[PDB]
Amino acid sequence: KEVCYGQLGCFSDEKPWAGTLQRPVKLLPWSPEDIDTRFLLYTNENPNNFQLITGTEPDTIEASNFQLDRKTRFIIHGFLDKAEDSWPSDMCKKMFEVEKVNCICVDWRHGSRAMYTQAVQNIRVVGAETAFLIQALSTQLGYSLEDVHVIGHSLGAHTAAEAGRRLGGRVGRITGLDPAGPCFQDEPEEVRLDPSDAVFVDVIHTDSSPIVPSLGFGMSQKVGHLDFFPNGGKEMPGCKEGIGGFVSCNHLRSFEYYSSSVLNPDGFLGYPCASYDEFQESKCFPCPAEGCPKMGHYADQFKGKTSAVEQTFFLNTGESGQFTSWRYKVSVTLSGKEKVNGYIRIALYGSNENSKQYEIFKGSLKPDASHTCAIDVDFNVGKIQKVKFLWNKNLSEPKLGASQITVQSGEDGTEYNFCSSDTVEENVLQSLYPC
Ligand SMILES: [Ca+2]
């Protein structure tokens, strides 16, 4: 069967759209009036309250704050969600701190309030309507498609991908923020996000699983030029029935990482890797000589970002606040006069602030023994001016130092070395100096 909806065309229920394993009932999208799609424009001049543009009356565009001379980004929420006064609309404000943008928030709350498989259909009209407005800006204003960015969370990711495909891949960038897996994973390219759908497609995977067993709501499948898997892809730090899987912490974490990257450009450098394990074991370190990609907002500055598909990258993120992180390789070589049991720590010191103390080894601490260790510092010190070392066991009172420490930056491979064959009591902060 099939329905038509005017300028948006028709929608059949033929495979692959419906009557497939994952889409077993034969459904069709609701009417545009029912989905009630809306384009909520925010600019630097109206950052807090939207102006309501539409493509069918392009006078609305003109009389809006929309600038032809500025970039334009769309943000598409997914299942059971909205734009007005939620993460899309706040993501606009964030952007307005760092750049001049036309932030359009596709709001289809009504069309996302329905059964999941019915929403998997509505996604399509929502896509059509966005694709229409983008064209509208092109035909009616002379705006360039390679200049539009469409950001999508969950279903919204596939909604971006639908509009992108409507525009025949002319849309310059799609960012997929943990694209929904149910109904899309391992489906044909037409019905889902895939590198074909824009000149540049970047994906952030945060709640990824296969279809069975169902471990989460995101996609394990790589579907962009760049596919980032922060913290391995499956389970993010800071998150502790599958009957609300789409509003789990891991899922929502994707748009928090994105929103953050808008303010912390290098907060989320991705390292190119085959697996998380390879990355953990630091077979994957430091960055390539010609820069790491900046996951999130500044993904588009990556050299050769479009040179291949499904380029895989791994990284670690913080558990709270800005969520930012910066990988360091750290190499302590011990000093002492007697072997002892306890743990070892290191703080990094710039003339910035300094870092919290990070663990490096537990158990058999012996003079002369070295231990090496990748660590995830939560803020950028810049040039490491000093490092401080601390070890801790109850007592007879013995001394243990660090004769030498080497910290390597992941960001650009810089090696620092530090010095002091000179031991200290327990829980005393020992300092080591450049050399
Ligand atoms: Ca597609």
Has 196 been annotated as catalytic? no
**Which protein residues have their CB within 5 A of the ion that is ligand 1?**
161, 165, 189, 194, 197
Active-site annotation holder among 89, 112, 149, 178? 178
The amino acid sitting at 35 is I
In this structure, are residues 73 and 95 in contact, taking their beta carbons and an 8 Å threshold? yes
Has 154 been annotated as catalytic? yes
Distance 58 CA to ligand 1 centre (A): 28
Distance 18 CA to ligand 1 centre (A): 16
Burial 385-411 (b: 16+ CB within 10 A, else e): bbbbbbbeeeeeeebbbbbbbbbbbbb
Active-site annotation holder among 77, 205, 251, 297? 251
Active-site annotation holder among 64, 89, 112, 154? 154
Distance 74 CA to ligand 1 centre (A): 17
Q: Which of 6, 20, 92, 108 is nearest to 49 (CA)?
A: 92
Distance 429 CA to ligand 1 centre (A): 56
Distance 192 CA to ligand 1 centre (A): 4
List binding-site positions: 189, 192, 194, 197
DSSP structure class, residue 100: -
Method of structure determination: X-ray
Rg of the chain on CA atoms, in Å: 25
Q: How far apart are CA 110 and CA 88, in angstroms?
A: 16
Listed in order, strand segments (DSSP E) in 2-55 are: 2-4, 10-12, 38-42, 51-53
Distance 128 CA to ligand 1 centre (A): 13
- Domains of the chain from N-terminus onward: 1-325 (3.40.50.1820), 326-435 (2.60.60.20)
List binding-site positions for Ca(2+): 189, 192, 194, 197
Q: Which residue has the tokens 């005017």?
A: 6
Task: Name every residue whose Cβ is closer than 8 Å to that of residue 259 and which is 6 or more positions away in sequence.
Answer: 87, 90, 91, 94
Beta bridge partners of 334: 402
Has 178 been annotated as catalytic? yes
Q: Cis omega before residue 213 (within 30°)?
A: yes
Q: How far apart are CA 248 and CA 390, in angstroms?
A: 38
In this structure, are residues 358 and 405 in contact, taking their beta carbons and an 8 Å threshold? no
Q: Which of 346, 354, 332 is nearest to 392 (CA)?
A: 346
In this structure, are residues 273 and 313 in contact, taking their beta carbons and an 8 Å threshold? yes
In this structure, are residues 329 and 382 in contact, taking their beta carbons and an 8 Å threshold? no
Q: What share of the chain is helix, strand, coil (3-state, %, to 5)?
A: 20, 30, 50
